[PDB]
Subunit: 244 residues, 2 copies
């Protein structure tokens, strides 16, 4: 069950933003959202795919363990902040595309499909190059699906060892307060055209008191200066809900 | 660890606040440690709430603690602190340093099993005498700053005599600060004010994952007044900031 919530609309209007926020308390069986339709509309996951990809890499042996260091080969990378040795969390936090491209390559097409079928991850479409399906390929996932996936990860219910799920879960911690804990991941497919904009994500969950809140946010974006919004809107909503 | 050296440049931070204490900072890659006081780095003090780390690990290994989602339910009886008077997660119980919650864990583990795991952990003098539910706060257990960093490193590398799964669960419960470039796992300790002539101890132990480097730390100080308690975080914080590790 997904229920529309009209009071969150002000945060999208003030910023003139076409997006959606899904927020589920305790479990994914009853979620609230500003837009029923968009909540289940599937977009390029981009860097949010680093979550399932981190689990898959661990399950397949490609990523050797928790303390694996992804070494830089000295060859130029698209961002300067990727041009260094990286940990799992490190690669996840700076969104180190080439690190995860190489992981994806070594997983291979067969195993990638197998695990995305297991995880019920989006349209499960990995076609159009193994190193680029989540960024420019055919893979599509919705905010509701991102939410169901993360709850499985939280509860250790994914088709993977609890060990490997815990490893990724720690790699996802972005905010630690005395009151609450935040696990989250950003995505950004690019700017695209004005007619066909890119997509920006912020997905994750919050552990406050003895309660859990699962969340996923996406929005249309044609200008990178609007990027901070992918965190500020869902944060503003969750702050006014008393969550963070 | 591999080596330790005395570094008296950190004394500035202790001198400013009239604090008698010690900081140990060890770099995982080089296996090398630095401390302002080699002598105190090896002096064994009451772990206080820092014992919650191994206690949580032992609690998860013996099955006394179910999993990472176990709620330590509050019945309704009056407790020593207002912050403890609610239902708490594993992290919550660790963060607020809930004494009754972990006493209950300790008692269900019992002396025999606690002794066994502390031997396996090499945790201080291994003296659990003075009541199963108070040996860490007012009993006979003593651990040093060098011992703590060795213990926490063993936890970090999952080398402790417990399942990796349980060591992961505790490691996340200890996360206290998260930034894009660094991650802080930490635990506070406070044994009480004692007296004017026999001061109490306050701890801050943990580790920082920064870049591909890991920094293990143990801080303690003589404390006779609760007003000086926030100094257990600020002094080592100021040290690690000046080392370029955090902030």
């Amino acid at each position: 069950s997904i229920t529309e919530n009209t009071s969150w609309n002000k945060e999208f209007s003030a910023e003139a933003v076409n997006g959606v926020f899904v927020l589920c308390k305790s479990s994914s069986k009853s979620c609230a959202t500003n837009d029923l339709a968009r909540a289940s509309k599937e977009y390029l996951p981009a860097s949010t795919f680093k979550i399932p990809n981190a689990i898959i890499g661990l399950e397949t042996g490609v990523i050797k363990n928790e303390h694996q260091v992804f070494k830089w080969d000295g060859k130029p990378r698209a961002m300067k902040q990727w041009e260094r040795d990286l940990t799992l969390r490190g690669a996840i936090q700076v969104s180190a595309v080439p690190v995860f491209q190489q992981i994806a390559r070594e997983v291979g097409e067969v195993r990638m499909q197998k695990y995305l079928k297991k995880f019920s991850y989006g349209n499960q479409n990995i076609s159009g190059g193994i190193d680029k399906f989540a960024l420019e390929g055919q893979l599509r996932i919705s905010a509701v699906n991102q939410v169901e996936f993360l709850e499985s990860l939280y509860l250790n219910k994914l088709s993977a060892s609890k060990e490997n799920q815990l490893i990724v879960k720690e790699a996802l911690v972005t905010e630690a307060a005395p009151e609450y804990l935040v696990h989250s991941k950003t995505g950004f497919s690019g700017v695209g055209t004005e007619s066909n904009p890119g997509v920006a994500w912020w997905v994750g969950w919050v552990e406050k008191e003895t309660e859990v809140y699962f969340f996923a946010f996406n929005m249309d974006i044609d200008n990178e200066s609007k990027l901070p919004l992918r965190k500020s809107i869902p944060t503003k909503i969750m702050e006014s809900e008393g969550i963070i």
